Amino acid sequence: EIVQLLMEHEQTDITSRDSRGNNILHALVTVAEDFKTQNDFVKRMYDMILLRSGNWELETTRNNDGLTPLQLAAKMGKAEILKYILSREIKEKRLRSLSRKFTDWAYGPVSSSLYDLTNVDTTTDNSVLEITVYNTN
Amino acid sequence: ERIWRLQRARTILEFEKMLPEWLRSRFRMGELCKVAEDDFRLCLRINEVKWTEWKTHVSFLNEDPG
Amino acid sequence: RLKKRIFAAVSEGCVEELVELLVELQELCRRRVPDFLMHKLTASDTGKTCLMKALLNINPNTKEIVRILLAFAEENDILGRFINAEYTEEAYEGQTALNIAIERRQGDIAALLIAAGADVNAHAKGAFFNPKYQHEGFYFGETPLALAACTNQPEIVQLLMEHEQTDITSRDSRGNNILHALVTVAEDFKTQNDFVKRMYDMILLRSGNWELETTRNNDGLTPLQLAAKMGKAEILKYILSREIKEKRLRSLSRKFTDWAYGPVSSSLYDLTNVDTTTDNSVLEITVYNTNIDNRHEMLTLEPLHTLLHMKWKKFAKHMFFLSFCFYFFYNITLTLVSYYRGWLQLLGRMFVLIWAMCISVKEGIAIFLLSDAWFHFVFFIQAVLVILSVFLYLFAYKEYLACLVLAMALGWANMLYYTRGFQSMGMYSVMIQKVILHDVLKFLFVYIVFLLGFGVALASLIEKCPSSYGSFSDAVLELFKLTIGLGDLNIQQNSKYPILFLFLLITYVILTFVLLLNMLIALMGETVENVSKESERIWRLQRARTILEFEKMLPEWLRSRFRMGELCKVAEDDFRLCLRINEVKWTEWKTHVSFLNEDPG
């Protein structure tokens, strides 16, 4: 409720980066320890804030370590939130652009989804598939 | 099982960086799909079968299922 | 110009008013006629009408758009040719507006379209609707009723059965009626939740006949036989034991209770197409079909399990024991010949050659039609060795004894085959087979490679002064002496560098030890759950295979002499072969209404 109140005001800067460089989404990635520990409330807030502000900027921005929050979720050992980020199906047609999983072929029980490999398929500097494999910590 | 899967993954990405620059662009997993007005993003297609939940498909990108 | 506006307008459906305006524009341009109105109202590329484009794109306004379009097409008298239009596209050939209304779970719209004169028998036959390869496209049976059934829509299926225009028994291009299709789709209980079984019940109870089960696809299979050919178990347990309570449709049941007095009751199964008295029965298919990979749960079903027990009790036990006895006498005669190597040979060797030729003929006959065939491949090689040695006995050579004793050792190794018929010792031999096939063969090659590495190593060192470890073959032999404990460890002599010699050998010992350790480890992991279940399954399947192998050896009159089952009087005149099984049920108490015989015998 308080998060909705703070998003309602025009004075609020959603995209504000802190001293460490993290916007709000990087922080939510920082905190999301585990399902049994937290009960996955962070995933809900990650959904709600993006659906509140329809943009790609928040995922676009980087902390001082030079990482998008997808790449931060991969660098840290955050799995339950990555399963959400890496496959999003937004139903609303106005904010449907922000989804990363698209169904294009559904006829019935058979359907083929369509994932986004933008920062994932090792075609960039450090993709998710590179980080999650080459990270020993 | 975990160590084996991780090892294979490490090997796959080790060989992925040995290839020439043109070879990786030659393979180039994925296809450019038309999403939104102009998403134009590289995508990976995965066919699945779901018998549990029945839902009238409202949100779909292509009308003729190819 | 005018068309694409209307197509996009029915696609979005933000307002039916502008759709009415475009339809009024078309009505005013109609002064120039149905054949033109159709082409103006239909995309000529794929053969896609605006009704199809309207039903593919569903929104809350669609229910009114369809009504407007059909009222327009009826006011212009094009309605019959308009609803029944189908795609000209190769992959989508035959799909109509009704199939779309069904696939997108529209109940009311489907009712409206059928009430407006839609074709319910329209066959959707295309590459997408007839997938040659799995996982690309969906097969439902190529009829609207089969679609509504495979997609779990019981109301629409009732609607389609209510109409007299519907052909229930219609076979598709592949030859399948609706029931074959439902057999095709029924993957598993957890995957589907067993809705297909309900529809299989409902359609037969809707049309009381035997025809649907009687008919055959182009592969020449009844849907029972199709359920057996494919690995469909959960539906077969239903088909193979049906108790229909309704007295009017009670004839269509395959399980009849004739003897119920109380907790004790004996059911009566139908063995019409099941008891191997036909061309290919269920008991033949489910056993001799290797592609299933699910036969463990197939042979535990009510009639088949007991049929196997009964055939074993009647004839297969005695034949198996008798064949084992003959083989035992044969092998002993072979040993008595070879150990003492003429008046006794005239009695022995004749039988030996005859029985060897017999086994070789049988094995060469049955080897052309094919971890279940391994033994049967070995019984041939043994008889080959025997007949070769008997030829080389009259021929002047010394190489006859080699093949003879190898045939001996192979016979005493093959007698393990017949331990599979025993109750307790059978799973033991299955354990031998599975472990020697999977767990040990991994160990053996990785041990041979160390043998052949350290062999050339030690042959390189200890050849300095031509010696304990001599040539390569002797060094490999000495290493194999070492892993057992037989080869006495010699202090390095006639060797260039003794410390490396000893270190390299101790490393061989340690690596062999940890490798033996790991085969034991993978074994411990294997044993707990999978190994036991696999052993029991393989044993049961093997017995079933043997029972049906001996069942086909008998003369024609003998099988008719056994003839498991009795002819019962069911219905006005069912007159079918049946199998009686007595059971005791204490859980559920029910006043027995449906019973065949009144006096429980």
Q: Report CB contact under 8 Å: A107, C138.
A: yes
Nearest to C252 by CA among C199, C280, C211, C293: C211
Query: For residues C493 and C464, what is the distance between their CA atoms, to the nearest angstrom?
Result: 10
Dihedral Cα C455, C461, C467, C468, nearest 10 deg: -40
Nearest CB neighbour to B56, from listed C104, C128, C152: C104
Contact C109, C101 (CB under 8 A): yes
Q: Report CB contact under 8 Å: A109, C137.
A: no
3-state secondary structure of A134: helix
Binding-site positions of C for Na(+) read 485
Question: How many Cβ pairs within 8 Å bridge chains A and B?
Answer: 86
Query: For residues C578 and C568, what is the distance between their CA atoms, to the nearest angstrom?
Result: 7
Contact A14, A58 (CB under 8 A): yes
Contacts of residue C92 in chain B, CB cutoff 8 Å?
64
Contact A76, B18 (CB under 8 A): no
Query: For residues C385 and C600, what is the distance between their CA atoms, to the nearest angstrom?
Result: 61
Q: If 0-12 CB within 10 Å is exposed, 13-18 middle and 19+ buried, where does residue C307 land?
A: buried
Contacts of residue A110 in chain C, CB cutoff 8 Å?
137-138
Contact C171, C177 (CB under 8 A): yes
Contact C243, C251 (CB under 8 A): no
End-to-end alpha carbon distance in chain C: 83
Query: For residues C593 and C257, what is the distance between their CA atoms, to the nearest angstrom?
Result: 10
Tokens of A5: 């109140």
C56 to chain A: closest CA residue:
A107
Question: How many Cβ pairs within 8 Å bridge chains A and C?
Answer: 10
* Experimental approach taken: cryo-EM
Tokens of C599: 């006096």
Per the DSSP assignment, residues forming a β-bridge with C580 are C268
The answer to whether residue A134 neighbours chain C at the CB level (below 8 Å) is: no
* B-contacting chains (≥3 CB pairs under 8 Å): A, C
Q: Enumerate long-range contacts of C445-449, CB under 8 Å, 24 or more apart.
A: C446/C515, C447/C512, C447/C515
Query: For residues C5 and C1, what is the distance between their CA atoms, to the nearest angstrom?
Result: 7
- DSSP string computed for C538-568: HHHHHHHHHHHHHHTTS-HHHHHHH--SEEE
Query: For residues C233 and C298, what is the distance between their CA atoms, to the nearest angstrom?
Result: 6
Resolution in A: 3.4
